[PDB]
């Protein structure tokens, strides 16, 4: 009954294991992002104990990329705005990124896919 647990209610499971959950807030149009494309995005990332994004916004899907973010982008279409929840396996894991991100944190990302080429 954390809020993130509540939000995860009825979200789309793109990964199969509930590790990457998605809510489309505005649909795009046309083709889905290609497996190695270079996307143009605006993103914000959130942790639950915080009231500000922990991180706020071109991107090649060679970059050392957040796994949840990569799988998320692959599900998106141009013009789309979606919110995602990444469980620890798809985010920062057991280690986290101390002291900013604790061990075993589910993070929330809002991503807007402006374009990809």
Swiss-Prot record:
In which compartments does the protein localize?
Answer: Cytoplasm; Nucleus
- What exactly does this protein do? Has an essential role in spermatogenesis. It is required to repress transposable elements and prevent their mobilization, which is essential for the germline integrity. Acts via the piRNA metabolic process, which mediates the repression of transposable elements during meiosis by forming complexes composed of piRNAs and Piwi proteins and govern the methylation and subsequent repression of transposons. Acts as a co-chaperone via its interaction with HSP90 and is required for the piRNA amplification process, the secondary piRNA biogenesis.
> What pathology does the entry list?
FKBP6 is located in the Williams-Beuren syndrome (WBS) critical region. WBS results from a hemizygous deletion of several genes on chromosome 7q11.23, thought to arise as a consequence of unequal crossing over between highly homologous low-copy repeat sequences flanking the deleted region. Haploinsufficiency of FKBP6 may be the cause of certain cardiovascular and musculo-skeletal abnormalities observed in the disease. A father and son with Williams-Beuren syndrome appear to have a common heterozygous deletion that includes FKBP6 gene.
- List residues of the PPIase FKBP-type domain: 36-117
Subunit relationships: Interacts (via TPR repeats) with HSP90. Interacts with HSP72/HSPA2 and CLTC. Interacts with GAPDH; leading to inhibit GAPDH catalytic activity.
| Family designation | Belongs to the FKBP6 family.
Which stretch of the full sequence is covered here?
19 to 143 of 327
Q: Please give the tissue specificity annotation from the record for this chain.
A: Detected in all tissues examined, with higher expression in testis, heart, skeletal muscle, liver, and kidney.
What is the designated name of this protein? Inactive peptidyl-prolyl cis-trans isomerase FKBP6
């Amino acid at each position: 009954q954390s809020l993130y647990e509540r939000l995860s209610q009825r979200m789309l499971d793109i990964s199969g294991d509930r590790g990457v959950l998605k809510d489309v807030i505005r649909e795009g149009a046309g083709d889905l992002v290609a497996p190695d494309a270079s996307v143009l995005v605006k993103y914000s990332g959130y942790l639950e104990h915080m009231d500000r994004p922990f991180d706020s916004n071109l991107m090649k899907l060679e970059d050392i990329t957040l796994w949840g973010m990569e799988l998320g982008l692959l599900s998106m279409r141009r013009g789309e705005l979606a919110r995602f929840l990444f469980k620890p396996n798809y985010a920062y894991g057991t280690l986290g990124c101390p002291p900013l991100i604790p061990p075993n944190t589910t993070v929330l990302f809002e991503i807007e896919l402006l374009d990809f080429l």
